[PDB]
Design a protein around this ligand. Structure first.
Ligand SMILES: Nc1ncnc2c1ncn2[C@@H]1O[C@H](COP(=O)(O)OP(=O)(O)OP(=O)(O)O)[C@@H](O)[C@H]1O
Ligand SMILES: Nc1ncnc2c1ncn2[C@@H]1O[C@H](COP(=O)(O)OP(=O)(O)OP(=O)(O)O)[C@@H](O)[C@H]1O
Ligand SMILES: Nc1ncnc2c1ncn2[C@@H]1O[C@H](COP(=O)(O)OP(=O)(O)O)[C@@H](O)[C@H]1O
Ligand SMILES: [Mg+2]
Ligand SMILES: [Mg+2]
Lengths: 878, 254, 394, 384
């Protein structure tokens, strides 16, 4: 190699620092002049971020590193101007001279004091001059300083101002990925007190640029998915004004504040609803937002939009109250029935091409599955009526309710259709008719029969199980309304303390799907009834399927978990009687990240050999491991699958050999080859040594997913194997139901509980009893057949793009592709790589698919989500 | 018995009840040895040459040199020749002057004739022909020799000519292989024929064959030299005057 | 800030995960060992329920029988033939002659019946999969699609109106036309939409080395087809398995004539195949044998011809609806510029227009790109064009 | 193992650390749960006892067989090497997922029960027609063309390097390419350059080897070749001098001219059949394109036709400059004199002249080449 010659800096400037010890005294001019000349030369070389090895900062580490370390403290004659030239010259090399743990040694140059206005001279670097210094200070120095002593000396007073200046300067040159690194520094510093950082960044974001707001809001919503409870509340309260204060869209804030309702507080949701009602913004945006504000994301929004200007602006709430359900039914039977939906498919029954009452009972379910999307039948199910007078009285009631299930979402003439066959004077016909009427009017939330017809059936409960078959339908028809009158009316049924235990259980399930938040008196009354009834008894798990389920549903949708702890303290008992310990705990944990909490809950008993002592606790723990799947971010799924394989299937006799495949249904409902092949491996095999009925339930959960594909014919092959093995009375009905449920029609397969963009979904509550409905033997004869059929009925059928205008003129102008799965990209961030599709129809848009627009459409109504964007006309693009 | 000593394709002794490995038998004859014993090429050497000095020089400059001295060719920066063609009337020395050259430079002599007795020694089915290289590249300094049969050497054409299933198409395939797609070096091909004017045009392109050597019928001096060479193996009498005997022969062949 | 610490933590986590996987011990697989988590329960029960309780049970073939006593004559491929009887648990009803049976190793007693031989080179022809084309991208030939679907699918879907009306539907169909027209694509669509079998076979697969092999393969194909309920067979490039009987001089190309004769014989005479529907395609039908084209074997003769004017517009629209083009491209002019062309040429025109757009930098293909792609693909490549000498089917 | 591909942060942001921490916590919880039963209720070794007993059941003499048929209830018919076939049972530790008819199955010696599955034995034809290492230097050695290279690049290289340009506007890359022109013009050299530069597996075959001496062997070769190409990987198939399959007739062929037709039909079937093709690229080269069947080169099978014309004077000078870069040329020689040597001189003649001149200089033991060497070399090479 070669040394010297061209290295002018390493000759004169290196000897100048050596002679500085002799120049400290009787040479005040030179100590500033040499520093200024070196700073100017360094700034000239550092004006470009390409030559890291500067001739002064990098070449001084041979012997000048100690000189820089011995500049401020080993002088004793620093001035008010020399100190600036000492701190500035020592803050640049000390940050990188040290080893990896340099965050704890940044106080000797830069953190000691602020030299002048170094932020003025820090605009020529990205993350080297001052951004690195701010990050180092916030990593260790400010973290320990500002954890509880934010008010301190210049190491914390001006430190906050410097950090804010650095955060502003990150998004000041180009608003590049350094702007994204600014949110990281804002989150790391004062994570719990993130409100101050958010307030500091809001002022910069509002006045920064008009196009620098959408990306910041998207990044904030992207990173809002994981934080502490207080941190999550602060984030949800800081990002609300991002689309409302800084931005003028005024439509994505109300839609995106759903995550700020259950997690933070109900008062936040009430304030958001009040503000949306007050901020009318004419009618277009407000009506578009409120159309999916009845049962798509949340409810009880038709009572706060009744202002004094109820003429054209505030009257639309009425359309939300009752007209929304009728409009949805008309759309499902108008744009789909006239395109591809025939009068009666009946194709599932004809698949057996290539005799007990069980077949007759499953025929009703098959007919209901194939009669979806307003499939009203006028005496088209005469087989069920004929079989109603032979056997299976409960099956007859299920068949009668299947008539209402055929005419789903009907409130116009559904009651007359049910009353056509209702007049039978039977202990099961009345219950079936009531269930059919309730299923027909699901989601209407109207005052059709609150206490007129439903109360008429409830007032004659001096009879058999007909009393219990008259509250599930009424509760389902009032699930979307949290009115306290219905809850109070249903409370006396559970509190009657009569022999009708089934009525009390159905009342608890019905009220859980109506109100799940405040009014702890209902939960206290349910707990008192359970303590009075189940304490002096040792009977079957009818109480366990009603008391823990009722307690969890009554206190469902609250992330504070204080109510759950209070209930656990008030329900202190043995672990066998404490089956609600994990059920109420997981009901209050609808959507969140609780891997550590799950491990702690499973730490009570990991295996413990399951010595017939805490079987209810083990079942609750297994069900709990199925949780944390509402918003798993496609990360916890693999770990959960591995844990289920290595813990339940790998080792188990009763708990791990029967309910191991139960969690597969709750994991997902779209249907993927990996899960469909893992479950088939443990379901197709006979394994007669184990509980074959459990294997049948495993198959029923393998095919629990809707939207069947062309591979479902393989299951039909197993049907051939079911002729001799897997006896008909114990497996044929289950296999037929599993095959039929997946391919019901073509639409109405959304059982994943995901509304719009990332909504947690209250529909899982309707699926919550269903997951608890199939956990034992004796299939379904009296209770299961009445709940497994109508457990969930709140699925949006098909359409994702329609004008929904006053004249409804526009039909379809879109282009479909795969869903958007990008986080950081260029300005027009790519969505997917499946642009190979383009259709001009308003039909099925696909589950994991998104449709974009062209021809200067841009969806000027919502442009975010909703599946019912109005897409207002625009002509600004020639 | 250690595994590393158990090389593939070896003879071993197996016990009866458990079929466990017991010993290692001496060896098995390689397929190359069997094939060459079947062909029975009558090897020779330089001392059996009559009046072919310049041919010897020409073939030495192409065959011997780019094996022992590759640096001599790298100094000039030229490609190493790979193919040689020999032509002349039959019975003139071509095979003898390719076997002696192969023997003196210590090269494995392989000849292919498309027969079917030796087909079991190459491959089970041998749908292609390049598979011979699998048996050739493990004897790296080797030479492949193919002689054109009398179907063209003597019978020329069958009435419409067309193509010869032997010799020429095999050489086309071989020369197409070792023209850049071959990694192993020190492999060469030799051709023997007569009346080069009947070669197909695809094989007369300038970039294919790097040298062509001629074998004219012997003259009086060469005939006398061959008579002198081949007259040693008999009990002769002092004074024969072989010049007259050589002059009597009107130069037919050797 | 702490990028190094995070990277080290992630690397340590990955290494620990790999180490834990190695610890669990799902290893080996040199000999075909299943992972321990799979055969963990199947470790000891099979030792005493599958090793001694189960026997070797060799397979043999019965040749004939006699009355009033079983006394069955059993033949094997390598050992001798014996006289034997049944076992205790087998009825004498399902012991019909000429079919494979199970036999002991010591006393030679029949135990179970077996299915017959299958010749795996014939078994590989079952499709077992579905291509991904539909009838929605087969534009330009609506009438041919209707005429083909009237016979291929409808009788199999609703077999109640034909029986009620006492009409027996046709069985075979042949598709002919110039190359590139569409035949194989239509066959793909049919195989996609179907629900029964789909046994595909190409004529070049029936040319065997030994004498008397093609007829055997055809017999095995039709036996396997008859075994199942009812499903379809597809013959591709039928003009390679038989042209015409022309034996003059030295016998040349007549074993293939025997194969063709066996194929002909399997479709008529002494209880025809019955519930099997075949369909064949070729590009030069002028060379097929007269005895093969008569009704009763090839009832339908759908013809595919070059599109006139609107077929070209439909092909252009359906091959370029996943493009990136502007709003002012008219396809009628493009259709008028190629008077006699096939669908393949139009698809190539679209692809070359896209490539010309990609050439320099741009993101949106313009009209000039389409015009110059048409000029370079149709006018310049008309040297080869493959078309003029097959419109005469020669 | 694709456990979690969500590493979108890829920076020093809190997102990457949070995702890594969550994945690590989940993995640690899973490992603790897995080892809870491994350390709390083992009840057996469960590590070496299993292998010991499966080896005890599996005897030391171990024969082989071939699958014929399999029944669903975990047994199958296997044929022995001698010829006898049995009805043995299939064990439960034999990972019954790769059991395929014709595969070598490892059987016991006592009761012939299925106890294992054995790997394959390579194949003595794959190594025959597979390229191992790059032949020579890339396009920098070609010179002259500068226009066919971009077309072959668009056909082959771009989808491998940049499978994003085609996805922006949704088109498919061109299917096939064919190279034609007078002999000695640089088709095989460009194929060599493509094989050097690319990263996919390269398979080559001369068209004169597609005709065999038995009946029904050509179609078998084509089927097996394309099966191999489709089963390895994204690959490139190079067939050169294809026209030689039709312009030459050999008496060694048992069949006449009809077997050539059958081979053609099989080749068309393989090129544009109806089953899924996968991702295979085909390159063809010939110097007589007027004798091929037109139905073989229709759009949809071969999409691009590329012509190689005879070089001009500028290309002649460029080829002189290329081929004498490492030669010690004396100042007497001039390339312009040799430029006008012939009216239709080709690329191969340049290399022939240079090489033979070098040889002639080597004969006389002279390192520097003179003008007379070239003067005699051109006469010795061209004029005959
Ligand atoms: N009606 C059509 N619509 C769209 N594309 C078509 C149509 N007809 C033919 N094609 C095009 O033809 C191409 C190949 O067609 P195909 O191979 O089925 O034809 P063919 O008549 O069977 O050919 P060949 O005689 O060469 O076997 C397809 O990739 C498709 O782009
Ligand atoms: N344009 C060229 N640039 C450089 N070298 C060339 C060129 N054209 C020909 N050559 C030389 O010619 C030699 C032979 O060329 P190559 O065998 O690839 O020709 P081809 O086009 O395949 O002809 P053929 O079909 O007659 O075999 C090359 O190795 C190279 O040295
Ligand atoms: N120049 C020669 N000197 C001595 N013997 C020769 C000469 N040329 C040929 N022969 C004889 O020819 C016989 C072999 O013939 P050969 O030349 O190998 O056939 P071909 O001409 O086909 O190569 C040898 O026995 C050898 O004695
Ligand atoms: Mg075809
Ligand atoms: Mg070539």
């Amino acid at each position: 190699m070669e040394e010297g010659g061209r290295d002018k800096a390493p000759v004169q400037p290196q000897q100048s620092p050596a002679a500085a010890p002799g120049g400290t005294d009787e040479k005040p001019s030179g100590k500033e002049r040499r520093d200024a000349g070196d700073k100017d030369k360094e700034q000239e070389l550092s004006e470009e971020d390409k030559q890291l090895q500067d001739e002064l900062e990098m070449l001084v580490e041979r012997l000048g590193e100690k000189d820089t370390s011995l500049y401020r403290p080993a002088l004793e004659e620093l001035r008010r101007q020399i100190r600036s030239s000492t701190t500035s010259m020592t803050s640049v090399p000390k940050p990188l001279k040290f080893l990896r743990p340099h965050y704890g040694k940044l106080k000797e140059i830069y953190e000691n004091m602020a030299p002048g206005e170094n932020k003025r001279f820090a605009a020529d670097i990205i993350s080297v001059l001052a951004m690195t210094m701010s990050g180092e200070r916030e990593c260790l120095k400010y973290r320990l300083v500002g954890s509880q002593e934010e008010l301190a000396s210049w190491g914390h007073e001006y430190v906050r101002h410097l950090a804010g200046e650095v955060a502003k300067e990150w998004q000041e040159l180009d608003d590049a990925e350094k702007v994204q690194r600014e949110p990281l520094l804002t989150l790391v510093k004062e994570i719990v007190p993130y409100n101050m950082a958010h307030n500091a960044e809001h002022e910069a974001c509002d006045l920064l640029m008009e196009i620098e707001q959408v990306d910041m809001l998207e990044k904030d919503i992207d990173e809002n998915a994981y934080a502490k409870v207080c941190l999550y509340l602060t984030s949800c309260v800081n990002y609300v004004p991002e689309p409302e204060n800084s931005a003028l869209l005024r439509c994505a804030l109300g839609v995106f504040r759903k995550f700020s309702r259950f997690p933070e507080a109900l008062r936040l949701a009430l304030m958001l609803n009040d503000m949306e009602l007050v901020e009318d913004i004419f009618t277009s945006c407000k009506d578009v937002v409120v159309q999916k504000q009845m049962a798509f994301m949340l409810g009880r929004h038709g009572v706060f939009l009744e202002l004094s200007e109820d003429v054209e602006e505030y009257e639309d709430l009425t359309e939300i109250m009752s007209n929304v359900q009728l409009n949805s039914n008309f759309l499902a039977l108008a744009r789909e029935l006239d395109i591809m939906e025939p009068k009666v498919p009946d194709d599932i029954y004809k698949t057996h091409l290539e005799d007990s009452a069980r077949m007759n009972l499953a025929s009703s379910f098959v007919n209901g599955f194939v009669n979806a999307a307003f499939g009203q039948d006028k005496l088209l199910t005469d087989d069920g009526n004929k079989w109603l007078y032979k056997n299976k009285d409960h099956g007859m009631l299920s068949a009668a309710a299947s008539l209402g299930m055929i005419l789903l979402w009907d409130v116009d003439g559904g009651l007359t259709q049910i009353d056509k066959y209702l007049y039978s004077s039977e202990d099961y016909i009345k219950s079936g008719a009531l269930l059919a009427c309730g299923i027909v009017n699901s989601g209407v939330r109207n005052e059709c029969d609150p206490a007129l017809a439903l109360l008429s059936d409830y007032v004659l409960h001096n009879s058999n199980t007909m009393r219990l078959g008259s509250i599930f339908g009424l509760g389902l028809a009032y699930a979307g309304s949290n009115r306290e009158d219905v809850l109070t009316l249903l409370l006396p049924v559970m509190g009657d303390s009569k022999s009708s235990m089934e009525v009390a259980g159905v009342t608890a399930l019905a009220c859980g799907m109506i109100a799940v938040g405040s009014c702890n008196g209902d939960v206290t009354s349910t707990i008192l009834q359970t303590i009075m009834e189940k304490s002096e008894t040792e009977l079957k798990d009818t109480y366990a399927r009603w008391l823990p389920l009722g307690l969890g549903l009554n206190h469902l949708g609250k992330g504070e978990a204080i109510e759950a702890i209070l209930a656990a303290l008030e329900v202190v008992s043995e672990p066998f009687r404490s089956f609600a310990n994990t059920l109420v705990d997981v009901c209050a944990y609808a959507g969140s990240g609780n891997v550590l909490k799950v491990q702690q809950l499973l730490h009570i008993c990991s295996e413990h050999f399951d010595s017939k002592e805490k079987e209810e606790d083990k079942d609750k723990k297994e069900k709990k491991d199925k949780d944390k799947k509402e918003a798993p971010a496609d990360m916890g799924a693999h770990q959960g699958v591995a844990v289920l394989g290595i813990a339940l299937i790998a080792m188990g006799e009763e708990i791990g050999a029967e309910m191991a495949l139960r969690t597969f249904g709750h994991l997902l409902r779209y249907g993927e080859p990996t899960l469909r092949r893992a479950v088939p491996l443990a379901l197709a095999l006979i394994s007669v040594s184990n509980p074959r009925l459990n294997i049948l339930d495993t198959l029923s959960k393998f095919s629990h997913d809707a939207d069947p594909e062309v591979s479902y014919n393989s299951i039909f092959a197993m049907g051939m194997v079911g002729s001799g093995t897997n006896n008909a009375r114990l497996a044929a009905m289950l296999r037929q139901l599993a095959q039929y449920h997946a391919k019901d029609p073509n639409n109405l397969f959304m059982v994943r509980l995901a509304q719009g963009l990332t909504h947690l979904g209250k529909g899982t509550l309707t699926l919550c009893p269903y997951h608890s409905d199939r956990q034992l033997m004796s299939q379904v004869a009296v209770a299961g057949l009445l709940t497994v059929l109508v457990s969930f009925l709140d699925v949006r059928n098909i359409i994702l793009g329609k004008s929904h205008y006053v004249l409804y003129g526009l039909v379809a102008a879109m282009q479909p592709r795969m869903l958007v799965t990008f986080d950081e990209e260029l300005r027009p961030l790519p969505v997917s790589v499946r642009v190979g599709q383009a259709v001009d129809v308003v039909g099925q848009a696909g589950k994991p698919k998104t449709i974009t627009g062209f021809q200067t459409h841009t969806t000027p109504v919502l442009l975010a989500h909703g599946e019912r964007a109005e897409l207002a006309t625009e002509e600004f693009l020639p | 018995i250690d595994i590393n000593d158990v090389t593939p394709n070896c003879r071993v002794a197996l016990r009866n009840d458990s079929y466990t490995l017991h010993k290692i038998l001496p060896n098995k004859v390689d397929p190359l040895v069997s094939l060459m014993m079947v062909e029975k090429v009558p090897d020779s050497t330089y001392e059996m040459i009559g009046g072919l000095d310049k041919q010897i020089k020409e073939i030495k400059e192409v065959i011997e040199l780019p094996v022992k001295h590759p640096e001599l060719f790298e100094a000039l920066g030229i490609a190493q020749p790979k193919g040689v063609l020999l032509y002349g009337p039959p019975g003139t020395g071509k095979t003898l002057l390719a076997r002696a050259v192969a023997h003196h430079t210590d090269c494995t002599f392989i000849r292919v004739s498309g027969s079917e007795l030796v087909q079991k020694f190459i491959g089970e089915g041998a749908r292609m022909v390049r598979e011979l290289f699998v048996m050739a590249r493990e004897h790296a300094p080797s030479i492949i020799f193919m002689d054109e049969i009398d179907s063209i050497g003597s019978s020329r054409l069958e009435g419409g000519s067309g193509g010869d299933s032997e010799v020429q198409r095999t050489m086309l395939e071989l020369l197409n292989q070792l023209d850049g797609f071959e990694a192993t070096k020190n492999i060469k091909v030799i051709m023997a024929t007569n009346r080069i004017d009947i070669l197909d045009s695809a094989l007369l392109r300038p970039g294919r064959i790097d040298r062509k050597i001629e074998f004219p019928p012997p003259n009086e001096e060469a005939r006398l030299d061959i008579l002198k060479i081949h007259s040693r193996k008999m009990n002769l009498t002092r004074g024969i005057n072989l010049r007259k005997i050589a002059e009597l022969m009107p130069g037919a062949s050797g | 800030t702490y990028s190094r610490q995070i990277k080290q933590v992630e690397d340590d986590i990955q290494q620990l995960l790999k180490k834990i996987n190695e610890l669990t011990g799902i290893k080996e697989s040199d000999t075909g060992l299943a992972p321990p988590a799979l055969w963990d329960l199947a470790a000891d029960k099979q030792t005493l329920q599958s090793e001694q309780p189960l026997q070797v049970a060799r397979c043999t073939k019965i040749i004939n029988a006699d009355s009033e006593d079983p006394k069955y004559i059993i033949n094997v491929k390598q050992f001798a033939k014996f006289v034997v009887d049944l076992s205790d648990q087998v009825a004498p009803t399902d012991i019909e002659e000429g079919m494979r049976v199970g036999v002991d190793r010591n006393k030679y007693q029949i135990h179970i019946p077996l299915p017959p031989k299958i010749d795996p080179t014939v078994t590989m022809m079952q499709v077992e999969e579905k291509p991904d084309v539909t009838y929605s991208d087969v534009g330009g030939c609506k009438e041919q699609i209707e005429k083909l679907r009237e016979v291929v699918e409808t009788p199999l879907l609703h077999p109640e109106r034909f029986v009620n009306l006492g009409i027996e539907p046709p069985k075979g169909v042949l598709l002919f036309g110039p190359p590139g027209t569409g035949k194989t694509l239509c066959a793909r669509a049919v195989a996609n939409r179907t629900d029964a079998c789909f046994i595909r076979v190409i004529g070049s697969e029936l040319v065997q080395k030994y004498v008397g092999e093609g007829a055997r393969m055809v017999r095995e194909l039709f036996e396997m087809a008859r075994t199942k309920k009812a499903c379809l067979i597809f013959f591709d490039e039928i003009d390679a398995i038989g042209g015409a009987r022309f034996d003059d001089g030295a016998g040349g190309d007549n074993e293939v004539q025997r194969t063709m004769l066996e194929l002909i014989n399997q479709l008529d005479g002494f209880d025809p195949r019955g519930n099997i529907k075949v369909l064949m395609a070729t590009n030069r039908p002028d060379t097929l044998d007269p005895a093969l084209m008569r009704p009763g074997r090839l009832d339908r003769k759908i013809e595919f011809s070059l599109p006139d004017l609107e077929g070209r517009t439909h092909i252009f629209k359906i091959h370029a609806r996943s493009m990136s083009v502007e709003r002012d491209i008219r396809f009628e002019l493009l259709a008028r510029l190629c008077p006699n062309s096939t669908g393949a040429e139009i698809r190539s025109v679209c692809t070359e227009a896209g490539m010309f757009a990609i050439r320099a930098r741009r993101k949106i293909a313009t009209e000039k790109d389409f015009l110059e792609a048409v000029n370079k693909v149709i006018k310049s490549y008309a040297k080869f064009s493959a078309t003029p000498r097959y419109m005469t089917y020669n | 193992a694709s456990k979690l591909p969500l590493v979108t942060p890829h920076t020093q942001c809190r997102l990457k650390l949070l995702k890594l921490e969550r994945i690590k916590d989940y993995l640690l919880m899973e490992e603790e749960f897995i080892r809870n039963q491994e350390q709390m209720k083992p009840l057996e070794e469960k590590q070496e006892e299993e292998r010991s007993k499966v080896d005890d059941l599996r005897g030391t003499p171990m024969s082989v067989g071939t699958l014929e048929e399999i029944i669903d209830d975990n047994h199958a018919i296997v044929s022995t090497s001698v010829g006898s076939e049995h009805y043995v049972s299939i064990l439960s530790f034999v990972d019954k997922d790769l059991l395929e008819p014709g595969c070598s199955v490892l059987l016991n010696h006592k009761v012939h029960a299925v106890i294992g599955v054995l790997m394959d034995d390579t194949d003595p034809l794959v190594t025959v027609m597979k390229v191992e290492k790059a032949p020579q230097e890339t396009y920098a050695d070609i010179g002259g063309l500068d226009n066919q290279i971009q077309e072959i690049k668009e056909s082959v290289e771009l989808p491998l390097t940049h499978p994003e340009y085609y996805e922006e506007m949704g088109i498919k890359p061109p299917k096939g390419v064919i190279l034609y022109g007078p002999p000695g013009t640089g088709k095989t050299l460009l194929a060599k350059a493509v094989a050097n530069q690319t990263s996919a597996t390269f398979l080559r075959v001369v068209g004169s080897e597609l005709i065999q001496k038995y009946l029904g062997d050509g179609p078998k070769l084509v089927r097996e070749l394309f099966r191999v190409a489709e089963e390895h990987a994204p690959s490139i198939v190079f067939i050169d001098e294809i026209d030689a399959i039709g312009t030459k007739r050999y008496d060694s062929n048992s069949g006449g001219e009809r077997e050539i037709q059958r081979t053609m039909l099989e080749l068309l079937n393989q090129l544009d059949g109806f089953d899924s093709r996968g991702d295979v690229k085909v390159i063809m080269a010939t110097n007589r394109i007027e004798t091929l069947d037109p139905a073989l080169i229709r759009p949809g099978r071969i999409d691009r036709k590329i012509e190689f014309p005879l070089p001009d004077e500028k290309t002649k000078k460029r080829i002189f400059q290329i081929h004498t870069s490492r030669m010690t040329l004396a100042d007497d020689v001039t390339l312009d004199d040799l430029i006008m040597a012939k009216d239709d001189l080709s690329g191969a003649d340049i290399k022939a002249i240079c090489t033979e001149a070098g040889l002639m200089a080597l004969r006389e033991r002279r390192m520097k080449v003179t003008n007379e060497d070239f003067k005699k070399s051109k006469e010795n090479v061209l004029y005959k």
